[PDB]
Structure 1
Amino acid sequence: EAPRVAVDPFACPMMTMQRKPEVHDAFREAGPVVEVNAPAGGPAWVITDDALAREVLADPRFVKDPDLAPAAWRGVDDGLDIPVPELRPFTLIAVDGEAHRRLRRIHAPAFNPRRLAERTDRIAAIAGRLLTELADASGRSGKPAELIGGFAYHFPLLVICELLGVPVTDPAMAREAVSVLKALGLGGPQVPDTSALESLLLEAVHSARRNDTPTMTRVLYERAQAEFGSVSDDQLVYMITGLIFAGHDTTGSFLGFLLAEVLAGRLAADADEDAVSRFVEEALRYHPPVPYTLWRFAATEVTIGGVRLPRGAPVLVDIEGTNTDGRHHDAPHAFHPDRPSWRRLTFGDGPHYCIGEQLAQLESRTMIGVLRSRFPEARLAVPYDELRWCRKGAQTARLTELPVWLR
């Protein structure tokens, strides 16, 4: 049926900043829907057309249900996001239908952008502390500040933890713990001492239960309880565990790119607000951290751009590819903020759209304000052309490193 390209779509060599993997162009040229090799055995189909993928993502026949995935995938493609049956109703990514509408109704007031905005200053603070520290340390050592390990993940982590009421002192270690928690909770084997974080997560929940203070975590607790009749501490810890993982790991991947672009000098020195939000917009087009959508499966057989897809056909949208489509974007592998503001799929589409878009963009804009207002001379300590980025399977794209002189 479909044009077939016999490769892992997740394959990814060491990459330079300007290029995207060639698999992407292969798929596109082969057609709107392309059979490829899934990492964990068996076929998979990849969409390459913006318009098509958008319909697919609002099409109830394409579902998250991890139980439709191939048996060979279970306990071997940690790219498969498979909570145990009884937590799936608390996992946004693993449901559709009313279970999903419910979770969405639960998260939406918690992510109220009025209330995100009210904490701009707190977020600037976080950025600045981190940046000062890395600067102060760079002056001491004489070595450049490595912004990936140093900032890109610690910044969004602290932000998202703070909004939930989760007091973190060691961002490096909270990251390791929350990563493990995530792994276990999305189906994975078997000592990152998660108990530490768990303790703090449980504290936020506890705090949320007893205090009418409208935290993010309290709003969650209120909506869950009304929707579910009754919610448990372990349930609320579980959900927020997921917000922390997503809130830091995807964002941080992105921010490393955004930084590299800012520090390379590609944003004009006197950029208005709007010029900045244009630069961010473009970096989100040009450096999506998530290559393809999350695993979706055909719930029946379906025929989609003239191709006929079996029951349980593993389907992906190509985010990286669609965003770098010569056809819909003039000079797609060039970085042009002033581009005629067009659509992208970096945050996805349809009922499962990223609920963090606002936050991630807020974080992005604010970070650039801190940098140009307090670190005006911050510059790459190596050439942009020598930077390199990579991803191993289902992991977000990220730079190997980002050496910087912050002042």
Structure 2
Amino acid sequence: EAPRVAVDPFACPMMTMQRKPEVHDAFREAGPVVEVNAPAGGPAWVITDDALAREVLADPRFVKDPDLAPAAWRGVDDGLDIPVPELRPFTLIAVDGEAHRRLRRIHAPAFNPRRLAERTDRIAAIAGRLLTELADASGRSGKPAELIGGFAYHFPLLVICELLGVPVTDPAMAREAVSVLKALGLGGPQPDTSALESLLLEAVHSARRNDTPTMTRVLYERAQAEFGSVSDDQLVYMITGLIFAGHDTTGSFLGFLLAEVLAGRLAADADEDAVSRFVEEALRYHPPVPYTLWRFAATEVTIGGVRLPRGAPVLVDIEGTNTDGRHHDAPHAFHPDRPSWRRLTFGDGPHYCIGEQLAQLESRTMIGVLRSRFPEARLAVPYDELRWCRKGAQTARLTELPVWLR
């Protein structure tokens, strides 16, 4: 029924900064709704048109329910987010309908942007200490600071950990361990995570004992109210998820944002408005997540002219719609003064990113620190020699970002 392009939608060779994988253009040329080959077997359908994508992502017939995914995917697709049944109610990405609204209710007050903003000075301090350490190591060594491994994931990880009351001192070890717990929680096979698990449980114990209106306290109070009774293990599971959600995507994006700033594309006298417009363009141009998470048709659906069967796995093309010439003049150029137009980098519909305000705050705070404390920071290699890639369902990321910070 649909036009068919017989390729894996996740195919990604090593890319330059300015280019996006060829599959996006081949899908868009085929039609608004394109059959493709799902990586773990059978068909999948990609949505290549912005307006249609917005309709799909708000249509209750397309659901996250991982039980609708083909049998062949279980244990293999790894892009499939499939908690054990009893943990799906605690997993924002695994539910829709009333169960999803409940979790949105629990998370909303915890991400109150007024409360995040009170943390700006701490966020700056975090970034500034990480950068001073990196500059000092480069002074001693004679080697450029490598900001992907030394900054991009560490900075957002330390922010979200501190917001949740989880006192991490080694972000590299924490990043590895929360990755393991994420994979286990979302249904992967099967390594030592006990140190991190101790800190997560300590943050939950502390949330229950103390009335201080922090993030984890508010999650606790609101989950207790909605579920009647919530266990320490359930809260640990929920905060594990927000640690991973809060750092991986953000850290992938920040590597790209850093590259564009350090390439000298931000005006030297840029005011706050110009900075936030620069961040906005970077979110259009370098989305870390190329497709929405899997949705499945709950019934037979005809959409954009095409008949999709019950069970049909559907992807919205974020990277391709963000760089569609039908809505963006010179879609593959980086133009921060471009008129502001919508993008799909944070999703749409009920499952829209709950972290967007935080990710923005972190972005603009990082640039402030850089501009004020490392005004001469530059790339240690040309912008045209930077490369990025992604395998499978992982976020897009630079291979490295070598910088002379001062």
CA distance in 2: counterparts of 1:170 and 1:377, whole angstroms? 28
CA distance in 2: counterparts of 1:393 and 1:2, whole angstroms? 24
Counterpart in the other structure of 1:338? 337
SS of the residue 1:110 aligns to: helix
SS of the residue 2:10 aligns to: coil
SS of the residue 1:316 aligns to: strand
SS of the residue 1:34 aligns to: strand
Tell me the CA shift for residue 156 of structure 1.
Answer: 0.2
Structure 1 residues 275-307: Cα deviation after superposition (integer angstroms, max 9, x where no partner): 000000000000000000000000000000000
CA distance in 2: counterparts of 1:309 and 1:75, whole angstroms? 25
SS of the residue 1:4 aligns to: coil
Identical-pair percentage: 100
SS of the residue 1:86 aligns to: helix
CA distance in 2: counterparts of 1:381 and 1:214, whole angstroms? 44
Tell me the CA shift for residue 382 of structure 1.
Answer: 0.2
CA distance in 2: counterparts of 1:293 and 1:71, whole angstroms? 21
Structure 1 residues 199-246: Cα deviation after superposition (integer angstroms, max 9, x where no partner): 000000000001110110000000000000000000000000000001
Structure 1 residues 89-125: Cα deviation after superposition (integer angstroms, max 9, x where no partner): 0000000000000000000000000000000000000
Tell me the CA shift for residue 326 of structure 1.
Answer: 0.7
SS of the residue 2:110 aligns to: coil
Q: Which runs of 4+ in 1 moved over 2 A?
A: none
Counterpart in the other structure of 2:325? 326
CA distance in 1: counterparts of 2:212 and 2:228, whole angstroms? 21
- Matches of residues 20-169 of structure 1 in structure 2 within 5 Å? 20-169=20-169
Tell me the CA shift for residue 351 of structure 1.
Answer: 0.2
CA distance in 1: counterparts of 2:41 and 2:78, whole angstroms? 13
- Matches of residues 302-321 of structure 1 in structure 2 within 5 Å? 302-321=301-320
Structure 1 residues 37-68: Cα deviation after superposition (integer angstroms, max 9, x where no partner): 00000000000000000010000000000000
CA distance in 2: counterparts of 1:338 and 1:51, whole angstroms? 24
CA distance in 2: counterparts of 1:137 and 1:373, whole angstroms? 20
CA distance in 1: counterparts of 2:230 and 2:303, whole angstroms? 40
Structure 1 residues 142-172: Cα deviation after superposition (integer angstroms, max 9, x where no partner): 0000000000000000000000000000000
Structure 1 residues 184-210: Cα deviation after superposition (integer angstroms, max 9, x where no partner): 0000111x3211010000000000001
SS of the residue 1:27 aligns to: helix
SS of the residue 2:11 aligns to: coil
CA distance in 2: counterparts of 1:233 and 1:378, whole angstroms? 45
Structure 1 residues 120-150: Cα deviation after superposition (integer angstroms, max 9, x where no partner): 0000000000000000000000000000000
CA distance in 2: counterparts of 1:388 and 1:197, whole angstroms? 32
CA distance in 2: counterparts of 1:77 and 1:176, whole angstroms? 21
Counterpart in the other structure of 1:397? 396
CA distance in 1: counterparts of 2:95 and 2:375, whole angstroms? 45
Q: How many residues align?
A: 406
Structure 1 residues 336-359: Cα deviation after superposition (integer angstroms, max 9, x where no partner): 000011000000000000000000
Tell me the CA shift for residue 360 of structure 1.
Answer: 0.3
Structure 1 residues 227-276: Cα deviation after superposition (integer angstroms, max 9, x where no partner): 00000000000000000001110000000000000000000000010000
CA distance in 2: counterparts of 1:261 and 1:214, whole angstroms? 37
TM-score, scaled to structure 2: 1.00
CA distance in 1: counterparts of 2:157 and 2:372, whole angstroms? 22
CA distance in 1: counterparts of 2:42 and 2:132, whole angstroms? 49
CA distance in 1: counterparts of 2:399 and 2:77, whole angstroms? 23
